[PDB]
Design a binder for this molecule. Structure first.
Ligand code: HEM
Ligand code: HEM
Ligand code: A1CN4
Ligand code: A1CN4
Ligand code: H4B
Ligand code: H4B
Ligand code: ZN
Lengths: 419, 413
């Protein structure tokens, strides 16, 4: 009827009514919680392929209603005309097209609704590039390049999303096959170990199999693998002057720069699906800026990622005989100091996990004030180091699925029929 | 019918069938998840019958005697008592099995690989607070074992009508007092300020120091609770020093060696044991991250960072993170040097994965609360962070219960 959330550090209690608008299942039941399952649910708002009218139109009506409500209308002439125009359009094309205002509203609100995103205080400050006129991989490359340049902004990063044509029947999908716009290759070495980023060994192999000539380094920016209108994907090298990179150095450990580490500045997620009023934008790359832990904890220290902890600890002369010396924890901190120090020294936008989590608490408070709630996935919001010394650790969160939303989708190479 | 959990670091996939036996609520709905809520929201004869049966059935199933003569007579015997007395009495075997399985079922506990090595102290014959004191003293001395810590639970008489509850008013058996000062500052453990006040009001004469072990506040049979000082020779404490920083010992930090939770309710076959203090040994982060560095707690981050010459002007220096690791190093180093059992969070989380995998193999699952299993520091560099976990409520279970001062109706005019 109304659920409260408490912050156990501050004793602030917030009352959530927004969850009454939740549309699709979380995966949880009264008898089992799936809050740590990465992909708990397959409940999707529309069937797999081109849906019937009684399937697509109710979702369309819901979103148009929501948008016109959002702008202090509902029932107005323009809203009632919009419904009938969406009605005729589905009647004659089995789909409908969003107005530019509706598209922008939907994209910002999918970011707003992203329960796993700690950076959502920025949600209304998103630059939306409408790419729905795109027809070819070359066009997608052009759009993505402009995205990267605008978003990077010589280090003063800007949040942006570029929205390619929506799904129609499923055989003409636009996809960015890359999971992120900028990632490093991963190479399976002859012995058995891995050079570069081990997460990308398979995508790297597709690219090589697709004709990419790997430089076979540890930080080879992958090509773009762009699919337009269901056709076979195409390789494009992003112009390197558009890929801003930060060499990682340490403010005290001078030997740290000699680890030869760098990272890219633009996190740009490109494998997710943006759903608005039953429409599915299968190619919608979006970018913001890094929280330092993403690089420094996960990218650098995950065992199946760059896995640098041991080498850093070595150089720090740490007791690595046993776990109880906390050599992993000590190196982990120094690595994340270096990552933040390097990005800040190069004037590349980055936020530490203390600032970001504090911002998110403030965002929650704003959202509960004006919206009646804020869906938040504690498992993802709490940073992967020093959790309890960040405010979000002590903050209860309600997780629910609002629409518009970003959704996961199958990797294209599991589903694409090659021509 | 089946549910799979994946470990994204290893790709191991386990198949959970055990969840089909859960019966209590999780608090979540099909449309809202409440996985991060700390606390999401007496039995009659007819309520008690199926709960008892369910537990007796599971007990005899565990010992491969389901359907047996002994199983069927026990069921009939339990039914007699519920009909006669509106309640029943567990056999000793059932009490031990029930207590161990409440631990085994504690979704929030990372130390469950040890669940079957639980020393169960039956104190259901206790009738007075003096008696509880005696039981708790023996519990502490046994558990503490001169630093070689052993898991133990002492189970006091079950709830009858709710008017005669046994309660340990302490949240834990060993805790340090907290005193608020006129100037607003806090001396000791700020968490225990309220409970320290209750004790002082009950007549406790506080030393007013930083690490005063609180007295036990013990309630027997629904009577007013009574104060007892744990004999100081039974409270094993560890002075915290750092292997590298000579100055760390100068912070005057110490901690007690025995973590012993005493405010929970043990529920076995529908019976409620409102006083069941249990203890194990510490994971270092409980002291080094939570006890010492929570802003609401001892809050020594700035002090330690200060002595570390850290730049505390900007968060992005990660001074808090850096100071936090050192504090937790000191905590582990101190206990190990004094040969007091402790486990670091890497070893603990690794054992829990082994445990969880074994439990999936021998039991069909392992309810686990990721929000609690993941340590409060260095989260993703432990294996549990990457482990998908299903959370569900099996019984026997440990349950929260109201604090006694919020419910107790005082007798003494
Ligand atoms: C502006 C700065 C931003 C910051 C600091 C930020 C931070 C984060 C972080 C740390 C995560 C968890 C990522 C991980 O562990 O893999 C995340 C997830 C996410 N972010 Fe944000 N984000 C930002 C902008 C954006 C924007 C512009 C969008 C979309 C318009 C967005 C949508 C999402 C979504 C959908 C997720 C869920 C990821 C998933 O389910 O895989 N974020 N964000
Ligand atoms: C043997 C060594 C043990 C270790 C290393 C251990 C470790 C832990 C830790 C780190 C937590 C989280 C506590 C917190 O962060 O506040 C926890 C919770 C818990 N432990 Fe264990 N524990 C041990 C033994 C036991 C025993 C013997 C029992 C019961 C017989 C038990 C029952 C519980 C319960 C019920 C919880 C969660 C209670 C709640 O919801 O607050 N544990 N344990
Ligand atoms: C569970 C999936 N996980 C393995 C993905 C890891 C990953 C790799 C990568 F290169 C990324 F750019 C990435 O972006 C997340 C992200 C997105 C945005 C918009 C901002 C920030 N700040 N962060 C996430
Ligand atoms: C309210 C938040 N905070 C105070 C935690 C409360 C709490 C309640 C509880 F019942 C617990 F069992 C618990 O576990 C601590 C614990 C217990 C044991 C036996 C061993 C270790 N090593 N640790 C912690
Ligand atoms: C709000 C959140 O549920 C709360 O801070 C939880 C998070 N995880 C925890 N995990 C453990 N082990 N102990 C705790 O007290 C908490 N607190
Ligand atoms: C099993 C678990 O849900 C998985 O490791 C999650 C945990 N929390 C996370 N949180 C963030 N932000 N990103 C992640 O990839 C993950 N991984
Ligand atoms: Zn849930």
């Amino acid at each position: 009827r109304f659920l409260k959330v408490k912050n156990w550090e501050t004793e602030v209690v917030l009352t959530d009514t927004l969850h009454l608008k939740s549309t699709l299942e979380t995966g949880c039941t009264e008898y089992i919680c799936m809050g740590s399952i990465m992909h708990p649910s397959q409940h999707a708002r529309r069937p797999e392929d081109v849906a019937t009218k009684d399937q697509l139109f109710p979702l369309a009506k819901e979103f148009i209603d929501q948008y016109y409500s959002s702008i202090k209308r509902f029932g107005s002439k323009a809203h009632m005309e919009r419904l009938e125009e969406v009605n005729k359009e589905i009647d004659t094309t089995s789909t409908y097209q969003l107005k530019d205002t509706e598209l922008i509203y939907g994209a910002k609100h999918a970011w707003r609704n992203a329960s796993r995103c700690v950076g959502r205080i920025q949600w209304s400050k998103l630059q939306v590039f409408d790419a729905r006129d795109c027809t070819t991989a070359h066009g997608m490359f052009n759009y993505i390049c402009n995205h990267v340049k605008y978003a990077t902004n010589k280090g003063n990063l800007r949040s942006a999303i570029t929205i390619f044509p929506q799904r129609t029947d499923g055989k003409h999908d636009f996809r960015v096959w890359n999971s992120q716009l900028i990632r490093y290759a991963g190479y399976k070495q002859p012995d058995g170990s891995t050079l570069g980023d081990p997460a990308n060994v398979q995508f790297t192999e597709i690219c090589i199999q697709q004709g990419w000539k790997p430089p076979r380094g540890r930080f080879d920016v992958l090509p773009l693998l762009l699919q337009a209108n269901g056709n076979d994907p195409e390789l494009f090298q992003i112009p390197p002057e558009l890929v801003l990179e930060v060499p990682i150095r340490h403010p005290k450990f001078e030997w740290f720069k000699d680890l030869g580490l760098k990272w890219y500045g633009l996190p740009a997620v490109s494998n997710m699906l943006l759903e608005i009023g039953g429409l599915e934008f299968s190619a919608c790359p979006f970018s913001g800026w890094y929280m330092g832990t993403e690089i420094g904890v996960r990218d650098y220290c995950d065992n199946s990622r760059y896995n640098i902890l041991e080498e850093v600890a070595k150089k720090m002369n740490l007791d690595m005989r046993k776990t109880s010396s906390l050599w992993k924890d000590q190196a982990l901190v120094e690595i994340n100091i270096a990552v933040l120090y390097s990005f800040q020294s190069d004037k590349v936008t980055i936020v530490d996990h203390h600032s970001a989590t504090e911002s998110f608490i403030k965002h929650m408070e704003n959202e509960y004030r004006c919206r009646g709630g804020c869906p938040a996935d504690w498992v993802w919001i709490v940073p992967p180091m020093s959790g309890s010394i960040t405010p979000v650790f002590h903050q209860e969160m309600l997780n629910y699925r609002l629409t518009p939303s970003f959704e996961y989708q199958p990797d294209p190479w599991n589903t694409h029929v090659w021509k």
